[PDB]
Design a protein around this ligand. Sequence first.
Ligand code: CQA
Length: 288
Amino acid sequence: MRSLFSDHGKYVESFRRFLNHSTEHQCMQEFMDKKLPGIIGRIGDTKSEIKILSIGGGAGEIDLQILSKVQAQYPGVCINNEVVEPSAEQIAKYKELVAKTSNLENVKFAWHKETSSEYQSRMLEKKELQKWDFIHMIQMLYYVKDIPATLKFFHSLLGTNAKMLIIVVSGSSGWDKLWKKYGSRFPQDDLCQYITSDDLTQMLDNLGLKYECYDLLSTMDISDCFIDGNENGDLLWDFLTETXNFNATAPPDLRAELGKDLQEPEFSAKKEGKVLFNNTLSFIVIEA
Ligand SMILES: CCN(CC)Cc1cc(Nc2ccnc3cc(Cl)ccc23)ccc1O
């Protein structure tokens, strides 16, 4: 088999179906509306500029919502939103989104086509480290080589009253169960780390950083995954397994097995007929 990250083709397409078959964005949006305002309430205090660093910003749809909340707390204040993203493709999409979005006059965007790691190296050379008021790393620590070094470095970039938000799947999610029970069944992955909020809180504890973690239930409708002849299902199987052509490249044993307990209370829930895989998310807020 081959990590999904490989075939850029389906990698991007399996994710598309994921969002259309999950509550991932609704969950995040819920967090931005109910919890974020309170979290960023003082990051702009005494500042004539608010610096926001988006690590791993994809097309920026969540980025803009966060910006929305920031502007709401600090009307009139210029916002400098820098985005660190290696994909020239995501950057292009992010830009087009920004161009079609109204009420962004007060915001200056900057895109850095590189990984958080490269960004780190480049900054460490500079005469001095620049501070940020808000840094967010949404669903991307999975693709980082050195997580503790990333957490420690970006936390060191936090200014006075600054905050750092991290989002990854929760340790109580179905992903955690899925990775513990079938982890061995798959080959080593130099392109992806299968970590959850449990791994993060452990690293944060040892790092001695102050943080708070909130969990919000989220679901992934994996119904189509149980219909042999279904294009969408097969795509969901790739995402769910972080594997290129899973059904086609995976031992019938692993396949038949997974498709069995993927319907167990252990991994999913059955409501309205649908099979809802546990996609519970964790929102981690770190203080300067
Ligand atoms: C390695 C693990 N899986 C899930 C636990 C994590 C994971 C990755 C993502 N991000 C993505 C996965 C696959 N293709 C993608 C393609 C694009 Cl253009 C942007 C983000 C992607 C989103 C949610 C999520 O939970």
